[PDB]
Amino acid sequence: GTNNGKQFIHNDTMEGGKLVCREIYAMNDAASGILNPVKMYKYSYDTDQQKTVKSTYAWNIFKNTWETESRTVISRYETETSVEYSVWNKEKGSFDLSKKYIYITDNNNQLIAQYAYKMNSRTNQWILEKDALTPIYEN
Ligand SMILES: [Cl-]
Ligand SMILES: [Cl-]
Ligand SMILES: [Cl-]
């Protein structure tokens, strides 16, 4: 970003009008001008179950391969959207639930309330971090 002085560019792959892959690059050499891969997002849609899965991969510079970094599951329930963010646990071979977000709108798509949670790894229960009504609904 602007504050850290690091520039990135992306390349999107579309399929049937939807984004299925987004690859992130950075320019790390001028003797070549080659854009180096940094991150890759893969999107898995399921219209019937109203669920989108975004899988994130990070470029492993030692192995020169992609490695599983995280997973975001977006579930739609009309006025309610639930987002679960999980981190890949390398030495477990599974995804650990980390953050959860809930967005509630009215029937006109105006946000009513937003909630954020962080997973307590000791108790396996979500900790509330944020809960706020928007000014129009604050009444
Ligand atoms: Cl980007
Ligand atoms: Cl494309
Ligand atoms: Cl939607």
As a whole number of angstroms, the distance between CA 55 and CA 21 comes to 10
Q: Contact, 49 vs 56, CB < 8 A?
A: no
- Looking at residue 85, the DSSP 8-state letter turns out to be E
The domain that holds 63 is classified in CATH as: 2.40.128.720
As a whole number of angstroms, the distance between CA 22 and CA 113 comes to 30
As a whole number of angstroms, the distance between CA 46 and CA 73 comes to 11
Ligand 3 centroid to 22 CA: how many Å? 19
Count other Cβ atoms within 10 Å, centred on residue 85.
Answer: 20
Q: Contact, 43 vs 21, CB < 8 A?
A: yes
Tokens 């490695």 found at: 67
Residues with CB under 5 A from ligand 2 (ion): 13-14
As a whole number of angstroms, the distance between CA 90 and CA 96 comes to 10
Ligand 1 centroid to 22 CA: how many Å? 8
Exp. method = X-ray
Nearest C-alpha neighbor of 40 from the set 64, 63, 11, 15? 11
Q: Contact, 98 vs 90, CB < 8 A?
A: no
Structural domain containing residue 88: 1-139
- Looking at residue 109, the DSSP 8-state letter turns out to be S
The count of structural domains within the chain is 1
Q: Which residues contact 64 (CB under 8 A, 6 or more apart)?
A: none
Ligand 2 centroid to 39 CA: how many Å? 18
End-to-end CA distance of the chain: 38
The dihedral formed by the CA atoms of 58, 38, 1 and 86, expressed in degrees to the nearest 10? -10
As a whole number of angstroms, the distance between CA 99 and CA 120 comes to 10
Nearest C-alpha neighbor of 102 from the set 76, 135, 120, 124? 76
**C-beta contacts of 33-42 below 8 A and 24+ residues apart:** 35/9, 37/66, 38/8, 39/69, 40/66
